[PDB]
């Protein structure tokens, strides 16, 4: 019920974000750390406890809906915790014929199709227990060995194999920057996969997310485990409208088939404001319902950059804001009405409004507050930018030379890597084209 | 309700046609009983649960059934109307109720 979703975590990051991820839903929902009932009356249908990520056994103790690939590390530290019994060690697979990604694309894609009829056996376990499936959720890195080639190679095969459901990547981008150059090699061969297989892509610049990590939380001991948390609270609120349908204006499916332009732009930012806390101080910065909408049209706070916290000088394709917490609605609705009339989005020459906001209250299985919180997903067309840069690093790189010998032996790269030049002109041609629908040739007679 | 009746005898017992204080006997029985009807109408029968239910189902707020039934039934619909239509949308009524995830816990 509510079209149910399958979580495919990636490399590292995937599955260090996805056992944070289980833990948030796992309190929301008032449930336990083996996914155990809360035994007096805390869930009388008050909310819907999501079976798009749970499964139910018999003896009531949901289990989350996800498959992990990766090595043993993150999987091991889930296993010591007791966070064992809301995972399930069948979903779980653990390289021991990886042999050392590399960091190399090709490396990782090519492990995966050596072992596809495990993993398929593991997908298609989780596709037999879903009821009618809505989609996928793939949680990865790019720029990695692992985060990159097995996710790419998962993605290609399950746009051939069930080419009727919606495939969702929340992926992790590296910086508008380099100084590692085969990041462009890595970053390139993946981007393709992730551009014509997925539906969907959501962005999370690296370089941007550290800066909420240093500045917000104000460690010194940081890491990724710590950065994680940031991106387990964005990628929660996201699924807000899923786990609650009981909101009769927020369902999921309908919202995100209307937000969607075309695939062809689908590479989506987030924002957000104010923060949680997970690793510093509490949150008891309280401000007005005025300063709450204020604070959602600023893209001060950047947790992406993907060019359009640099400028606006294009069009955005559409924004959609994401609020969490009642608060007064009449309120809501005169501010809402400046903010449309007020045109804070650039615009083309035929799209001059097409940005959606959608109310959500909080959960009371948390304590109580009266400090609302929003969201900020949005597709721009400023994007192309990011395959711009790209395009300069894979010039960069093709101009050294550098490890041409792996490319050899696979007939695709033969005369070195085709693959790659075959990309750089198709990603041209895309960039062209977002231009076009920018200016007035987009509707022409 | 006994005791009432004998506050009425008590005071037709002295009467000199008190009607302000008669009243206010009346008065402090009629907000004792309105809030025990509230208890019996909210509690029991489930009276507060009842309204949002309407507000669900007549104003359509309950968005998740109605995308179900609107797959079910599309088909059905989509042909010209007969007595036995009436059975299975009643039947994917009841499947839309499953569907929507509505169910007895307390």
């Known amino acids: 019920m509510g079209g149910e979703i399958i979580t495919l975590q990636a490399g590292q990051c995937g599955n260090h974000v996805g056992k944070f991820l289980w833990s948030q839903l796992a309190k929301e929902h008032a449930i336990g750390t083996d996914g155990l009932s809360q035994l007096p009356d805390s ?78 056996n593991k997908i298609d376990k989780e596709i037999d227990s879903t009821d009618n499936f809505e989609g996928f959720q793939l949680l990865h890195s790019v720029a990695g060995g692992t985060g990159s ?89 996201v699924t807000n409208s899923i ?10 499916s309908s919202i995100y088939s209307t937000l969607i332009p075309s695939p062809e732009l689908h ?17 008891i910065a309280h401000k007005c319902h005025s300063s709450y909408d204020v604070m959602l049209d600023l893209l001060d706070p950047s947790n992406s950059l993907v060019s359009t916290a640099m400028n606006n000088p294009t069009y955005f394709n559409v924004y959609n804001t994401i609020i969490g917490n009642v608060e007064p609605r009449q309120i809501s609705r005169a501010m809402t009405k400046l903010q449309q009339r007020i045109k804070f989005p650039s615009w083309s020459s035929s799209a001059m409004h097409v940005n959606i906001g959608r109310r959500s209250p909080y959960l009371p299985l948390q304590p109580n507050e009266n400090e609302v919180s929003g969201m900020m997903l949005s597709n721009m067309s400023t994007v192309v930018n990011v395959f711009e840069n790209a395009c300069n690093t894979f010039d960069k790189v093709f101009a050294k030379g550098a490890f041409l010998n792996n490319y050899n032996v696979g007939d695709l790269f033969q005369s070195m890597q085709n693959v790659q030049d075959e990309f750089a002109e198709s990603r041209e041609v895309v960039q062209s084209l977002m231009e076009d629908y920018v200016a007035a040739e987009q509707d022409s007679y | 309700e ?36 509230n208890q019996i109408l909210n509690q029991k029968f ?43 949308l009643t039947r994917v009524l009841q499947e839309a109720v499953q569907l929507s995830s509505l169910r007895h816990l307390m």
Not at chain 1, 164 to 183: D, G, H, M, N, W
Not at chain 1, 273 to 282: E, M, R
Not at chain 2, 53 to 69: E, H, R, T, V, Y
């Open chain 1, 267 to 283: 590479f989506l930012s987030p924002s957000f404001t104010p923060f949680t806390s997970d690793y510093i101080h509490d949150d």
């Open chain 1, 243 to 252: 786990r609650f349908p009981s909101y009769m204006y927020s369902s999921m």
């Open chain 2, 2 to 37: 006994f005791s009432k009746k004998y506050h009425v005898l008590y005071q037709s017992n002295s009467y000199r046609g008190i009607s302000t204080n008669f009243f206010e006997i009346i008065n402090d029985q009629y907000s004792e009983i309105v809030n025990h009807t």
């Open chain 2, 46 to 88: 489930h009276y507060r649960d009842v309204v949002f239910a309407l507000k669900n189902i007549l104003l359509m707020g309950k968005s998740d059934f109605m995308d179900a039934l609107i797959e079910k039934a599309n088909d059905i619909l989509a042909t010209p109307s007969d007595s036995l239509p009436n059975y299975k």
């Open chain 1, 149 to 237: 080639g097995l996710g790419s190679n998962l993605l290609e095969a399950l746009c051939d194999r069930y080419p009727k459901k919606i495939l969702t990547t929340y992926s992790v981008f590296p910086a508008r920057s380099s100084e590692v150059v085969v990041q462009s090699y890595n970053t390139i061969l993946a981007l393709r996969r992730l551009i014509e297989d997925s539906d969907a892509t959501v962005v999370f610049d690296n370089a941007s997310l550290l800066n909420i990590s240093g500045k917000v939380f104000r460690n010194p001991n940081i890491d990724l485990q710590h950065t994680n948390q940031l991106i387990s609270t964005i990628i929660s609120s």
């Open chain 1, 43 to 120: 869930s009388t249908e008050r909310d819907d406890d999501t079976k798009p990520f749970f499964r139910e056994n018999c003896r009531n103790k949901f289990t989350p809906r996800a498959i992990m690939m990766d090595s043993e590390p993150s999987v091991i530290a889930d296993v010591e915790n007791t966070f064992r019994g809301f995972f399930d060690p069948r979903n779980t697979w653990v390289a021991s014929d990886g042999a050392s990604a590399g960091n190399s694309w090709a490396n990782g894609y090519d492990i995966g199709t050596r072992n596809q009829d495990d993993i398929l």
